[PDB]
């Protein structure tokens, strides 16, 4: 019996003092269960995560729910272990909160189930696997200019309202239905409305009963929103370690991990860093993201949406997570306001997969020539913006003429965007879009109007839309 | 097994283990404070009760600021810290060659223990002004834009700087792959990277036979910022072990900006006052301590050298940031990689106008100077005259011929990935460029001309290549002309 | 950051006790204040109460801490009027650590499997007084049934361990 | 394969060695140490005194 | 009177003495410690006093690395600041911060006098009343950016342009024509380049007149503080005793300020604007006001300046520039053209280029040279694109005389004699004003574009053009 | 062009779904074509089918304050 008092309550941060020699280690869960002795008190079922050691046998913790009601002197239970999330075949088809408790009204998990701790070290050097094979998505910019790596880390960089949740739902619709394995969705600081819509789409399309869903949405206090991704990650780790199975991680707004760390770091006694972010902005995201790996047992292909604050790609939280990703797609608001959806920057989006030995010679030549014409059109936008299209020297006019067609044929109708416009959406194979961009780069479709290429799957659909326009 | 155990029990001597200790005040974020430890030194290995090492940096009056070099989750308030009695050291030797190693010196690749006999301190003074010699011998990278326009010598540190996905790590790996013929010992220090990226780099080194002479030092992002802080100093200590023996070492520091972020974290958690961008005061001193240790010693100090290639990642081309302008003001020249040139087909994306080599000319061989002194003039004239060819009426025939020569210069300076070119073929292809042997050939065939011309030099001629390898000079400018014209007979223009 | 402040306060009181010649009286008063504040913890919460005036708190300290010497009472009232009365047990620990070095006595904590005799502890003190440098040495013996068949001593911040160090050194040397 | 054999061999060795420690302590407890505790202690001071 | 170490906080060490035995500010403290056992390191440090804390405690700044320091180590008080040997003993010798010889030519015995580092500036009663021009013999320097005798000069140049060769012929010219010792002080800038500069001192014969002080980037920032003051107190001996017109070269004085900003954050000061120490103007002025020309001698100072990212608005380049009197900007485009020295004529300015100082004729000739070279740097794109045939027969006279002036701005150096065989020249101010006046009037339009290349006087232009056949 | 409603669109009363889509098309065409309107000669579509429709769309979509219209 080693139980302690509450010393300080500092927002989402609770100081707990134990007796000497009985302090818990860092990352252990602590429990507060209070029963409101009189009418001036509130029933409390709150849990705490140990973060620091302060001296004078006092422990600096981070709470997982709201601290509204805590009194200085309440009794804190030490569980002797980190936050143990129940895991196994039980999590398939279920929805969980941060503590591993089911929030889907289908029942509760017994105490006899196997449960793994949230906090564990990353896999070592000798355990990793670095094979690069292409995950086909059906998105033309993704298939051509930044191929997604099967078993690798994928990042979706965008601002607010730029086309990022729609793109990760299109990736779910294209990939997760035919994966033949376990998926895990982790909603970290997104809309609770989008947690309901996506659950009912999983129930409709039957992708549930092989997915496990964790929602720590933006109503939750930041101590929850930090550990959401770690709960969903240890659910993925059971499958890829114990069962050796291919796992999909979809994480929407992994920026909210670092932001929820930044909300607590000021109250943890830490000094501020660049742009108000914790000093540990790199190692807190290294303890999470270096742990999302493929091993020799099984693989995790993680597709992560990453919020970009104030449309600033040089912000320290998006800038330090580029170094973790195999493939990145950088969504731009300038392309979203042109009606180009997916609003993927074709130049700034890169991949480790785009190589001739991985994809093929002709794919690589078409992709690099597309990037060359788009860079040459990007270098002419000052002359076009001031002097116009009139003084380009008849090859730059040809570059602009083909590059408008290329930048519009990168745009594509989605199955998800059928509820937005009514157009039913398309799935484009990789050879079809390589043949399409090769036919555009050869000048086969210079006679068609440039608005005929907007939001179109294939070039046969380009031609039928252009003859529906009148050409 | 049991006979050796019985022999070591018979050789065992029991003594009293004496130790200076001290109890921990605070544990957290890879940082510990501790009472006691009255006789510790600044910058000292000190170890906890778990076996986890720590570095004693801040010695205040009543406590010690210990910097934890491992997983701190087992360390609690009240544990004791044991004074190891020695400064923070790195195990060095020939056994590190071909091994992926911790900055503490433990093997990370999992191929057994590393059998080293002696160590070096991780904090050592640089060679003085009298201890060095001027840089005069080439560090051949194999990239023709580097080995022609921004040359690197042995004993020189060169900053390769640019945005993300511009080609920095590829320049590093290609430079390390080229050192197979030379007596160079490479060291690739991977700082703050994803560890599967480090494994991809190690496997591309093993595929090209580069692990016979290189040492990979990895400090991944899951490791604490104390281990990212001590990774370049461990790398340069492993380098200077061979440098003070007479060997020649290349030390590649991939993303020293992540070392700057790790030391910013390390100083903010030790409650040191910030500066601009919350980096601490001695961040220039941090980078200068490791980039002044790269030198070329004199013939009294052994003659060995250590050339360095630090990397700095910029944010959207902001070259005027704090860590880029700190490292630009230290290194002996810069190599600017730009995405504007990278996505225009020009790869390696070296902006040779902005890129400076401050040793340059003493680094090149005598053939490369004669051949590249007009390469730089032709490319500078093309960069200046391309600005008037963007729009407008036209230019006359003379500077259009200059633009054609410059377009073929740009097409010469392009390479493929992980294909380093020897210097005797670089001087021949840039000799063919600058003497006018490419004006017959269109711009879209210069790469295939170079690819077939290297094969022609391998199977025909080849007395020119031996002349450039032995004498380091051009073979008298007439056998070259007849060999290039004999190949231009063979070449079929598309 | 309280030990460095209590060191200054205790060093001032220590220099007063040296120049006055009443070091035993000041030491007994400091031990009495430490025992009285360890036996009663509500006195700090009483004197931290802000509605009590400073004259009334000085009256409480002058009434309660009577019989002690004049500079000890002046030290307590000075800590009261400087709002540093929370560090009086830290002041007592620092002042006793100063006067133990003044007398030349050192405190040590011994762990042994069996409780040693009264002559063996004096023999250990006579051995270790030349190693530390003190004239007199104190041994505190704890029962401690963990260690087997030996004695270990922590004096200052240095541990002379030879009890179970043989088995741990053996299993570290073989493997 | 050669590394694998050398690592398994060290590991097993460590398990036997672990067992051997646990017992070493148990058996030393087992012996009657009236004579030994006085003898050890007297030696220990002497031993400390020399180093 | 010998105290303990309390804190070791990076390069900052806190030392506590006995009551009443405190050292004054800026005094040099010594730590000479032998390892008592295998758990210790032999240490020889020099600390200078920076602050006085509360209870007999002194914050210090270290000259070498503090790695190995134990709390409680004994510190020796010298009773004086850092004493540095001066005199004819320092000529040809390379020194560190502490006035100890870096090179292995020997050690200086204890009989020689040693001036302290920290010294007040010369008073207002003692300075020179009006501006005298330090005559160099360099035609760009004497014509367009005249160096005053006792002022401060800013070299804005990188590598590959010829900064070291310009430095060495400044040393040679002031040594042979003014009897002036030079002092080179390398302040935190590229140990390799200091080694190159020392071996070129040895090759050119310039080393026998030069005292050299090196503290480079490897040394902690207290050393990089006190280097420039070590070189300056070596120059002040020759000024205040020999009465000479001394050169004092500080390479990259930006490092003298950023070393202070590195120390001041750890000394416990509030940060000032842009992260620079709060005492930046006073620490700059206590260096720059000891570089004066008094009634006895003079100390003129050519100072290389590295501007970080070409931002001229951050406070440390601003306070280096507010002490400058002239700038000489070394341009790569003139070095690739063949013009040695590659001083940019239009961008290099001076406070002395005024007719009350240089005279009316020198001011008019220099202003007309600047006008024709500025009119020439407006036709560069027109010549490069549209050609020479299309310009005008009035502006091609401008580019004609502009090329004849632009190649006559280059000299043969005395230190370039070992590389080319040409002996080199010292050109007085009157003869170069007469030469540029005769080129501006049009007396030498018939001579070719060369024979102005790399000559001293205008009679050498006539002799070289007659040697070319014209 | 910048104002989006995600969850709306499924909220309309099945008459506005039938009617407002071509309103969005006409107003978007008018707002993107009016910036390059006063130049040269107008095409047969841009003379009447787009600009002379979009001007009427703009005049329909204007209201007076404190006068809400029922949805019918
Ligand atoms: N000749 C070339 N030089 C450099 N890179 C090339 C070349 N040809 C193709 N590439 C491609 O450019 C990409 C450069 O990636 P690299 O590994 O250099 O990343 P980086 O520049 O270190 O930045 P980051 O690691 O943040 O992506 C590689 O994926 C490679 O396929
Ligand atoms: N493929 C698409 N077609 C049409 N509209 C889209 C498409 N993708 C995104 N949008 C629009 O862009 C907005 C982006 O919102 P969404 O992607 O759901 O969340 P986020 O704020 O994460 O970007 C949506 O309102 C949607 O109307
Ligand atoms: Mg969203
Ligand atoms: Mg890289």
UniProtKB/TrEMBL annotation, chain A:
All copies of domain AAA+ ATPase, residue ranges: 150-335
Membrane topology: Peripheral membrane protein
PANTHER family registered for this protein in UniProt: ATP SYNTHASE (PTHR15184), ATP SYNTHASE SUBUNIT BETA, MITOCHONDRIAL (PTHR15184:SF71)
Its biological purpose: Produces ATP from ADP in the presence of a proton gradient across the membrane. The catalytic sites are hosted primarily by the beta subunits.
Binding, Mg(2+) 2: 165, 194
Record-listed E.C. numbers: 7.1.2.2
Main location: membrane
Keyword Membrane applies: yes
Keyword list, A-Z: ATP synthesis, ATP-binding, Cell membrane, CF(1), Hydrogen ion transport, Ion transport, Membrane, Metal-binding, Nucleotide-binding, Translocase, Transport
This protein's name: ATP synthase subunit beta
Family of the protein in this entry: Belongs to the ATPase alpha/beta chains family.
PROSITE patterns to which the protein is assigned, alphabetical: ATPASE_ALPHA_BETA
Entry annotated with the keyword Cell membrane: yes
One CC-aspect GO term: plasma membrane
Subcellular location as annotated: Cell membrane
Molecular function GO labels: ATP binding; proton-transporting ATP synthase activity, rotational mechanism; sodium-transporting ATPase activity, rotational mechanism
Annotated binding of ATP, by residue: 158-165, 352
UniProtKB/TrEMBL annotation, chain B:
Annotated binding of ATP 2, by residue: 165-167, 415
Location of the ATPase F1/V1/A1 complex alpha/beta subunit N-terminal domain: 18-85
Topology term for the membrane: Peripheral membrane protein
Molecular function as annotated in GO: ADP binding; ATP binding; proton-transporting ATP synthase activity, rotational mechanism
Residues annotated to bind ADP 1: 357-358
Record-listed ATP 5 binding positions: 357-358
Domain ATPase F1/V1/A1 complex alpha/beta subunit nucleotide-binding: 142-357
Location(s), subcellular: Cell membrane; Membrane
Annotated binding of ATP, by residue: 162-169
Binding of Mg(2+) 1, residues: 169
Pfam family, one: ATP-synt_ab_N
Protein name: ATP synthase subunit alpha
TrEMBL record, chain E:
SUPFAM superfamilies tied to this protein: C-terminal domain of alpha and beta subunits of F1 ATP synthase, N-terminal domain of alpha and beta subunits of F1 ATP synthase, P-loop containing nucleoside triphosphate hydrolases
Residues that hold ATP according to the record: 157-164, 351
Entry EC number(s): 7.1.2.2
Domain AAA+ ATPase: 149-334
Domain of life assignment: Bacteria
Gene Ontology CC entries for this record: plasma membrane; proton-transporting ATP synthase complex
Family, per entry: Belongs to the ATPase alpha/beta chains family.
Protein name: ATP synthase subunit beta
Organism: Bacillus sp. (strain PS3)
């Amino acid at each position: 019996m080693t139980r302690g008092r509450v010393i300080q309550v500092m927002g989402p941060v609770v100081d707990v003092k134990f007796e000497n020699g009985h302090l818990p280690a860092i990352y252990n869960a602590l429990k507060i269960q209070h029963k409101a002795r009189n009418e001036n008190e509130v029933d409390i079922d709150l849990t705490l995560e140990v973060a620091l050691h302060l001296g004078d046998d006092t422990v600096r913790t981070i709470a997982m729910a709201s601290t509204d009601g805590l009194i200085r002197g309440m009794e804190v239970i030490d569980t002797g272990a980190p936050i143990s999330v129940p895991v196994g075949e039980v999590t398939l088809g279920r929805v969980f909160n941060v503590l591993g408790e089911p929030i889907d009204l289908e029942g509760d998990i017994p105490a006899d189930a196997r449960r793994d701790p949230i906090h564990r070290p990353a896999p070592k050097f000798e355990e990793l696997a670095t094979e690069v094979e292409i995950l086909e998505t059906g998105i033309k910019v993704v298939d051509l200019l930044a191929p997604y790596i099967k078993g690798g880390k994928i990042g979706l960089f965008g601002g607010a309202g730029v086309g990022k949740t729609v793109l990760i739902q299109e990736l779910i619709h294209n990939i997760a239905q035919e994966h033949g394995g376990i998926s895990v969705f982790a909603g970290v600081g997104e809309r609770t409305r989008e947690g309901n819509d996506l659950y009912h789409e999983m129930k409709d399309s039957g992708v549930i009963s092989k997915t496990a869903m964790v929602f720590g949405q933006m109503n939750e206090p930041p101590g929850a929103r930090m550990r959401v991704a770690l709960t969903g990650l240890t659910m993925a780790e059971y499958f890829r370690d114990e069962q050796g199975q291919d796992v999909l991680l979809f994480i929407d707004n992994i920026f909210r991990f670092t932001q929820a760390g930044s909300e607590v770091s000021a109250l943890l006694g830490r000094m501020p860093s660049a742009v108000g972010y914790q000093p540990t902005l790199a190692t807190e995201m290294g303890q999470l993201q270096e742990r999302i790996t493929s091993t020799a047992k099984g693989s995790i292909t993680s597709i992560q949406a990453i919020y970009v604050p104030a449309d600033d790609y040089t912000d320290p939280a998006p800038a330090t997570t580029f170094s973790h990703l195999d493939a990145t797609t950088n969504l731009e608001r300038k392309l979203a306001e042109m009606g180009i959806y997916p609003a993927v920057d074709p130049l700034a989006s890169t991949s480790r997969a785009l190589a001739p030995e991985i994809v093929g010679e002709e794919h690589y030549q078409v992709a690099r020539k597309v990037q060359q014409t788009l860079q040459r059109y990007k270098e002419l936008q000052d002359i076009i913006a001031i002097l116009g299209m009139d003084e380009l020297s008849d090859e730059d006019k040809l570059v602009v003429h083909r590059a408008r067609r290329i930048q519009f044929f990168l745009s594509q109708n989605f199955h998800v965007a059928e509820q937005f416009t009514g157009q039913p959406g398309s799935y484009v194979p990789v050879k079809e879009t390589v043949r399409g961009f090769k036919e555009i780069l050869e000048g086969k479709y210079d006679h068609l109007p440039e608005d005929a290429f907007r939001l179109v799957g294939r070039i046969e659909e380009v031609v039928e839309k252009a003859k529906a326009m009148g050409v | 097994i049991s006979a050796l155990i019985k022999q070591q029990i018979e050789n065992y001597e029991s003594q009293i283990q004496v130790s200076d200790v001290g109890t921990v005040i605070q544990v957290g974020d890879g940082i510990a404070r501790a009472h006691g430890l009255d006789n510790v030194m600044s910058g000292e290995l000190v170890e906890f009760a778990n076996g986890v090492m720590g570095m004693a940096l801040n010695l205040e009056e009543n406590n010690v600021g210990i910097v934890i070099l491992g997983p701190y989750t087992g360390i609690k308030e009240g544990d004791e810290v044991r004074r190891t009695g020695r400064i923070m050291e790195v195990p060095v030797g020939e056994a590190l060659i071909g091994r992926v190693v911790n900055p503490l010196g433990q093997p990370v690749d999992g191929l057994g223990p590393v059998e080293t006999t002696e160590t070096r301190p991780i904090e050592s003074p640089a060679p003085g002004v009298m201890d060095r010699r001027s840089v005069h011998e080439p560090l051949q990278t194999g990239i023709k834009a580097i080995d022609a326009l921004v040359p690197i010598g042995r004993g020189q540190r060169e900053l390769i700087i640019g945005d993300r996905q511009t080609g920095k790590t590829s320049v590093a790996i290609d430079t390390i792959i080229n050192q197979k013929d030379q007596n160079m010992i490479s060291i690739y220090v991977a700082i703050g990277q994803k560890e599967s990226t480090v494994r991809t780099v190690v496997e591309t080194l093993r595929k090209h036979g580069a692990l016979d002479y290189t040492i990979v030092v990895t400090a991944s992002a899951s490791q604490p910022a104390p281990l990212l802080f001590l990774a370049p100093y461990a790398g340069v200590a492993m380098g200077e072990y061979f440098m003070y023996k007479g060997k020649h070492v290349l030390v590649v520091y991939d993303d020293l900006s992540k070392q700057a972020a790790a030391y910013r974290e390390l100083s903010l958690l030790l409650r040191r006052p910030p500066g601009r961008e919350a980096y601490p005061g001695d961040i220039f001193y941090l980078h200068s301590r490791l980039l002044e240790r790269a030198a070329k010693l004199s013939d009294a100090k052994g003659g060995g050298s250590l050339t360095a290639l630090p990397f700095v990642e910029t944010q959207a081309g902001d070259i005027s940031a704090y860590i880029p302008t700190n490292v630009i003001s230290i290194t002996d020249g810069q190599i600017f990689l730009q995405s504007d040139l990278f996505f225009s087909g020009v790869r390696p994306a070296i902006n040779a106008g902005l890129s400076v080599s401050r040793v340059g000319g003493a680094a090149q061989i005598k053939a490369m100077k004669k051949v590249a002194g007009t390469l730089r003039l032709d490319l500078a004239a093309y960069r200046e005259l391309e600005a008037f060819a963007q729009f407008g009426s036209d230019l006359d025939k003379a500077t259009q011929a200059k633009l054609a020569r410059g377009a073929r210069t740009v097409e010469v300076l392009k390479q493929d990935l992980h294909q380093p070119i020897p210097v005797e073929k670089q001087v021949l292809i840039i000799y063919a460029l600058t003497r006018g042997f490419l004006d017959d050939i269109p711009v879209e065939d210069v790469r295939r001309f170079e690819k077939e011309f290297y094969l022609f030099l391998d199977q025909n001629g080849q007395h020119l290549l031996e002349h450039i390898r032995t004498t380091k000079d051009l073979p008298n400018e007439d056998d070259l002309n007849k060999a290039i014209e004999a190949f231009k007979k063979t070449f079929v223009v598309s | 950051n309280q030990e460095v402040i209590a060191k200054r306060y205790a060093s001032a009181l220590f220099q007063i006790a040296l120049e006055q010649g009443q070091l035993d009286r000041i030491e007994e008063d400091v031990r009495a204040v430490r025992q009285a504040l360890a036996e009663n913890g509500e006195f700090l919460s009483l004197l931290s109460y802000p509605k009590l005036s400073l004259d009334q708190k000085k009256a409480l300290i002058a009434e309660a801490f009577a019989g002690v010497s004049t500079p000890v009472q002046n030290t307590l009232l000075l800590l009261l009027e400087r709002h540093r009365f929370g560090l009086v047990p830290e002041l007592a620990e620092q002042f006793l650590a100063l006067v133990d070095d003044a007398r030349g006595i050192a405190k040590a904590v011994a762990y042994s499997a069996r409780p040693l005799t009264d002559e063996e502890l004096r023999a250990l003190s006579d051995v270790f007084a030349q190693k530390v440098g003190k004239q007199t040495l104190e041994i505190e013996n704890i029962i401690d049934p963990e260690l087997i068949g030996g004695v270990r001593l922590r004096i200052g911040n240095r541990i002379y361990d030879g009890s179970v160090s043989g088995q741990l050194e053996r299993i570290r040397r073989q493997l | 394969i050669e590394r694998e054999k050398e690592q398994a061999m060290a590991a097993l060795r460590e398990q036997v060695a672990s067992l051997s420690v646990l017992i070493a302590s148990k058996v030393i407890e087992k012996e009657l140490t009236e004579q030994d505790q006085r003898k050890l202690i007297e030696a220990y001071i002497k031993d400390v005194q020399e180093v």
